[PDB]
Amino acid sequence: ILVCPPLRSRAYTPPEDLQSRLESYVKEVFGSSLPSNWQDISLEDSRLKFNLLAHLADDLGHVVPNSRLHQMCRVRDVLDFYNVPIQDRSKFDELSASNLPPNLKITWSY
Amino acid sequence: LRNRVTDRYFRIQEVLKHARHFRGRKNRCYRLAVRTVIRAF
Amino acid sequence: TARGTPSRFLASVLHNGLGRYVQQLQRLSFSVSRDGASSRGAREFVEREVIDFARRNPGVVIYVNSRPCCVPRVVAEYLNGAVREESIHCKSVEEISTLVQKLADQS
Amino acid sequence: PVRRSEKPNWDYHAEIQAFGHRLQENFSLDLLKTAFVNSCYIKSEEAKRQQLKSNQELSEQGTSFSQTCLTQFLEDEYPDMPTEGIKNLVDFLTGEEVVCHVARNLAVEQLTLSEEFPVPPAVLQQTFFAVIGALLQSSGPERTALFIRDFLITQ
Amino acid sequence: ADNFTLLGKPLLGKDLVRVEATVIEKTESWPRIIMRFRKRKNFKKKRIVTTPQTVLRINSIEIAPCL
Amino acid sequence: IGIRLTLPPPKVVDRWNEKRAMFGVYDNIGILGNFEKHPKELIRGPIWLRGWKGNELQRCIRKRKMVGSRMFADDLHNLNKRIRYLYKHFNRHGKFR
DSSP: OOOOOOOOOOOBOOOTTHHHHHHHHHHHHHOSOOOSOGGGOBOOSHHHHHHHHHHHHHHHSOOOOHHHHTTOOBHHHHHHHHHSOBOOOOHHHHHHHSOOOTTEEEEEOO | OOSOOOOHHHHHHHHHHHSTTOSSGGGTOHHHHHHHHHHHO | OOTTSOOOOOOOSSSTTSSOOOOOEEEEEEEEOSSOSTTHHHHHHHHHTHHHHHHHOTTSEEEEEEOOOSSOEEEEEETTTEEEEEEOTTOOHHHHHHHHHHHHHOO | OOOTTTSSSOOHHHHHHHHHHHTTOOOOHHHHHHHHBOHHHHHHHHHHHHOOOOSHHHHHHHHHHHHHHHHHHHHHHOTTSOHHHHHHHHHHHTSHHHHHHHHHHTTTTTTOBOSSSSOOHHHHHHHHHHHHHHHHHHTOHHHHHHHHIIIIIOO | OTTOOOOOSSSOOTTTEEEEEEEEEEEEOOOEEEEEEETTTTEEEEEEEOOEEEEEEEEEEEEOOOO | OOSOSSOOOOOOOOTTSHHHHTTTTTTTHHHHTTTOOOHHHHOOSOTTOTTOOOOHHHHHHHHHHHHSTTSOHHHHHHHHHHHHHHHHHHHHOSSOO
16 A cells, blocks of 8 residues: 655745756756856757756756646746746635735635 | 426516506406506506 | 605715715625636625725725625625615626625615 | 624624724724623623623713713804703703614614613613713814714704 | 895806705616507517616805905 | 425436446547547437438438338328328428428
8 A cells, every 4th residue: 555645735935046056957967068158058858858847846846837848948938937936825815815904804614 | 398487476476566556456467467567667 | 666666755864964974884795606607706806806995995894705605695784774685696897896886885 | 683793794893993984083992892882781791601891981971071062062052042941952962862863873783782682772872972982082072072063963 | 045145147156155065875766667668569668777866965055245 | 376385306416427427438439540430320329310310301201211111000100191291381381482
């Protein structure tokens, strides 16, 4: 019998040193000799793309979806995607966390 | 006998609630009532 | 028809507007559903417009009840003990805003 | 008839805040709560616990200010009426029917903590004058005199 | 007022008289029936309207010495 | 009074039956199976209505032509009368000529 690890959340804050971890990761996958504009290295090679995106997903806990895998053409696009923050919260919690005036009361009978 | 009418009571009740304050059989019989609510309007 | 309906004279609640104007709307109860396609517009109203309305009307208490229902509704309770229940079923956000502001303006 | 507290959609603190805001008066929250809680409610809850501050100070302060304030307005507007009539007009304005009508249409009855529903007229009058006393303690004599002028000279 | 009145031709002066009103209600009328019927021609039309309405309270009427 | 005084018994429906969960399966068998099979012969029903629509008169003619031999006597007589009536109506009556 195999035990299920607990369900992960989708809340993702981008780390402050995202640039330096991306520098590290592109150094282990794409090699030591950098082109000076490291932004515009293509991800047309699917093996290198898998290595980079799998390393980033395994480390940062956030994976690019299949609807955006074709859009991640460059490491600049990868950096943009990992800079975009997403949040996981029930929207009863969203409406409560929004600054409610003292005459507005919300009940959640669900 | 598929697709029969089931809210005919409520249609009749609309016309009769406009016909309620009348005199005679025209406040309760739908035919005589609907011939008089039209004239009232 | 006037002859088959009640009638009344022009009046205010408590000589309203003489010394000061008091908003006669007291409570608004919003029965909305989470998964109702009929309640979609009410859901958008709760997302966007109910906070600004509640800030613009500090004298009105707005309760929002998210519970499973087929017809989303609003109950307007007025200071003279009046109750007015309206269906917001399959209404868009601007129609719901117009209706709620109408309820606020009513006595 | 069942009181609005036992009716489903209710929250007392929000109702108190909206009462103050729709009356456009900067009430003190604790003073308004003590102006709405009555002694019969205390005795009933004591019996229920068997199975805090009343209205009385705020009620007497509000009643005394109401008498003095209404007497001053009436004898300034109408200097040629004598004392018996001025007193009786003040008694009409502070009487049971007028004060209970004003309190009911200002939703004092919904916010009144008592033992019996509907609220007895003496209890409603005492609670209304306790609200007047709380306003006198919170805002000042000129502002609560404007309040008295509005909600009783309009009657 | 009592003992005197003033007549404009056709309107009085704004320096002479003011009227002050207060918007106190914005409501709608009770539903009004508009119904058309012509006999032996199958002519029958029904419409419901609710005209908007505004209740104003006239607070004060003030006159000024300008005659 | 033609209206129920009590609520009807609740009509619970299971959306995940064999039939509901597998409706539409193999309906692309021709375009996904080298055209060996046709949806018209996936259709199950009367033998005279498999991959053929028709109107009422055409349905009656097709039924009499296909299964008229092995048909009951009064049912055959009714079908013949229906064909005669439908011929007369469709060929002689109507607004548009």
